[PDB]
Each structure stands twice: as C-alpha cells, then as structure tokens.
C-alpha cells in the first residue's frame, strides 16, 4: 500500500513494474538500477 | 541445502531397501538388499540348500 501514491485522481507507482511477471511486481529502488529479486533481474538506469 | 548430493558411484550411491545399510549390497542380477538381510529371505526367493 505504501508503494502507491495518488495525486489528481491518478495512481503513481513508487517503483517500476517488472515486465517479466506482470502488474503488481514493483522494482527495487537502488538509484543506479531497477532490480527485482524474484529472479534477480536488473535494468540499469 | 539439506538434500544429499547425487552420487552415481561409490558406497553412498547404494543403500539397502530393507534396513538401509550402505555397505554389503550384493548385486548378482540386481538384488539390492543387504547381505545379512539375504539370510532370512533366500528361501522366500526360492533358494534351497544342496
């Protein structure tokens, strides 16, 4: 719940959705990259 | 991390069905049984004394 912000009637997601699995899969905010540990997939920013 | 490693050779790869002894398991055509177990079951397999 803490990873969904809302302004002006639209939902902002604090972290990027991982395309491998689908929606509801946030990403790890490390600054230098976007990482998801479900499979250890990293996309460098 | 609790699984035992695979072994296709050596004593650890082999284990008696009945008692689980890792050691003497005779394999004349594939019995797969401990040697001491064999004594009480040989007649049940049909073996006789001559």
């Amino acid at each position: 719940w803490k990873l969904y912000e809302i302004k002006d009637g639209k939902v902002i997601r604090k972290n990027k959705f991982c395309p491998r699995c689908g929606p509801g899969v946030f990403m790890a905010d490390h600054g230098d990259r976007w990482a998801c540990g479900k499979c250890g997939y990293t996309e460098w920013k | 991390y609790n699984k035992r490693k695979p072994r296709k050779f050596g004593k650890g790869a082999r284990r008696c069905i009945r008692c689980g002894q890792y050691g003497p398991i005779i394999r004349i055509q594939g019995l797969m049984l401990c040697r001491h177990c064999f004594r009480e079951v040989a007649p049940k397999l049909g073996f006789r004394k001559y």
């Binding site: - | 005779i26 004349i28 055509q29 040697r35 001491h36 064999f38 004594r39 040989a42 049909g46 073996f47 006789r48 004394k49 001559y50």
Partner: protein, 102 residues
C-alpha cells in the same frame, strides 16, 4: 515352410513337464508336425555369503542355488495349431516366449 520356436522356462520341473506334455497333446491332436522338446541347458545361479552377521567366528560360508530349466519346442506352421496355444493354462512360474522363423 514356416516354423514357430517356443522356449518354456521354469524353476519347477514338474510344471515344465506338464506344460510340455499338454503342448505335445495339442500338437498331436491338431496333426501338425512338432520337433520334440529339446531340453536346453539349465541355468544354475549361485550366490555364496558369510553366515555370521558380524565379523566374529570361523570363516563360515553358505551356498544358495537356483536351478532354472528351459526347453525348446519347434512346430510347423498351422494357424489352427497356433490358435490353441494361447488358451494353454500357464503356471505363474513358467514363462513361455514364442518367436516366428521363416
């Protein structure tokens, strides 16, 4: 000319002789030539093992034997003769394997 080769194997001798006898009666009842049952060499499986469970005592060894006898019967082609063999009651110990040879 076409032939059927039948190999009949059993640990029990008497079961094997009964199977051979009824095969003979079938083959002579259908009037089709049969090669007499050739008793092929009997297999003697041998296993020796030390009697004592632990390592104590005199070196004692026990011998265990399995004598399995097999026989060969060759018959000449006749579909009538081959129809009656699948109805032969075969004991649980006797294994019959049949091949067809030209």
């Amino acid at each position: 000319m076409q032939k059927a080769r039948i190999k009949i194997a059993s640990t029990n001798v008497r079961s094997l002789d009964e199977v051979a006898n009824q095969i003979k009666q079938i083959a002579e009842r259908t009037g089709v030539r049969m090669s007499g049952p050739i008793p092929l060499p009997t297999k003697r499986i041998r296993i020796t093992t030390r009697k004592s469970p632990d390592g104590e005592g005199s070196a004692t060894f026990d011998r265990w034997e399995l004598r399995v006898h097999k026989r060969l019967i060759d018959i000449e082609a006749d579909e009538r003769a081959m129809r009656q063999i699948m109805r032969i009651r075969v004991p649980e110990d006797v294994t019959i394997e049949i091949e067809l040879i030209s």
